């Protein structure tokens, strides 16, 4: 199954291991990779972490690959498999954000990294966008940000608990000489079971 929340969680763990040697460390010496719009229970907001930090944000989830990729039957349930394409926005904030972002791009193509990302997420990278060197004016100085749009593709399998598959077929057939003949010339009754 596909859950955007789980996908963002999976990406964050990957970014910590992949690009962690260039970010800042908190009180637990954990590289500052956070999910966008942080918030705990109810309205408990989240503080802006230290500089060189990474923000992960799943922009949306489109399905340009058709309504249903395939429909198979599991043990006793009909399972639909839909193909999704999730654009995830990874943005690095802080001084020298562009240099940090560039390293991640050249590191998101390595086979070892993508194999790691394929695990614990279940998705595979489709492509990586362009990195704009953005300068925004907060209050006094300019904060460097380098957003990047990583596009992921994943297959979600959901089970319809109201399937009730076929196991027996009963066929009644008649043979006639012309279109009509209310008394059929010969009658066919079939009964095929899975036993």
């Amino acid at each position: 199954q596909l859950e955007t929340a789980e996908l963002e969680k999976g990406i964050v763990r990957v970014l910590v291991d992949v690009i962690g040697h260039r970010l800042a460390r908190d009180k637990n010496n954990r590289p500052n990779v956070i999910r966008a719009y942080p918030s705990d229970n109810s309205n408990d907001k989240g503080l802006k972490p230290d500089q060189p930090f990474i923000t992960v944000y799943c922009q949306d989830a489109t399905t340009p690959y058709g309504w249903v990729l395939d429909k198979f039957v599991e043990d006793d349930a009909v399972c639909y498999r839909i193909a999704f394409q999730i654009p995830v926005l990874i943005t690095v904030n802080g001084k020298g954000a562009h240099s940090i972002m560039l390293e991640l791009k050249q590191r998101l193509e390595m086979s070892t990294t993508r194999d790691y990302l394929a695990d614990m997420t279940g998705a595979s990278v489709l492509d990586t966008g362009a990195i704009p060197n953005d300068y925004t004016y907060l209050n006094t100085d300019f904060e460097n940000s380098a957003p990047l749009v990583v596009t992921l593709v994943k297959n979600s399998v959901l089970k319809d608990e109201r399937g009730s598959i076929i196991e027996r077929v009963i066929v009644d057939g008649e043979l006639v000489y012309e279109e009509g003949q209310e008394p059929p010339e010969y009658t066919i009754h079939l009964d095929v079971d899975s036993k």
């Binding site: 009180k27 954990r30 956070i34 918030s39 705990d40 229970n41 309205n43 503080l47």
Partner: protein, 130 residues
């Protein structure tokens, strides 16, 4: 009979200032929150855009928001990203409030030094833990 201590409310302060980001990536607020009664004056904030007790007719329902000013001598804090502070929650009629924006007249005069706070009602939201 100081007007500065007319009303009495209960403030929840995140005393155990931990506020760390879990390994997964979400935000884990302070696990220890204490509620101790304070005293202050709560008045409606009348300034232009700021709306007090105003129902907002959205195409999804009717939401209600308000903004009150708070004169008090207590040092209530606000969410700060340098000292890892996590704001203070004021309570009026049960509904939780948040201390956005602060004015610090703490040392200026002798018998009139006070803090001025801008308390905002917290919007209704589904709660999920992390």
């Amino acid at each position: 009979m100081r007007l500065l201590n007319r009303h009495s409310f209960v403030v929840k302060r995140k005393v155990s200032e931990d506020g760390h980001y879990n390994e997964d990536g979400d935000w884990v607020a302070s696990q220890d929150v204490v509620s101790i009664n304070c005293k202050g004056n709560i008045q409606p904030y009348i300034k232009g855009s700021v709306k007090n007790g105003t129902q907002i007719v959205l195409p999804e329902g009717i939401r209600l928001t308000d903004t009150r000013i708070l004169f008090t001598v207590a040092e209530l804090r606000t969410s700060d990203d340098v000292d890892w502070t996590e704001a203070d929650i004021v309570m009026i009629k049960g509904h939780e409030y948040e201390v956005f924006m602060t004015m610090d007249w703490s040392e200026q005069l002798a018998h009139t030094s006070h803090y001025e706070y801008i308390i905002i009602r917290r919007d209704k939201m589904n709660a999920v833990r992390n």
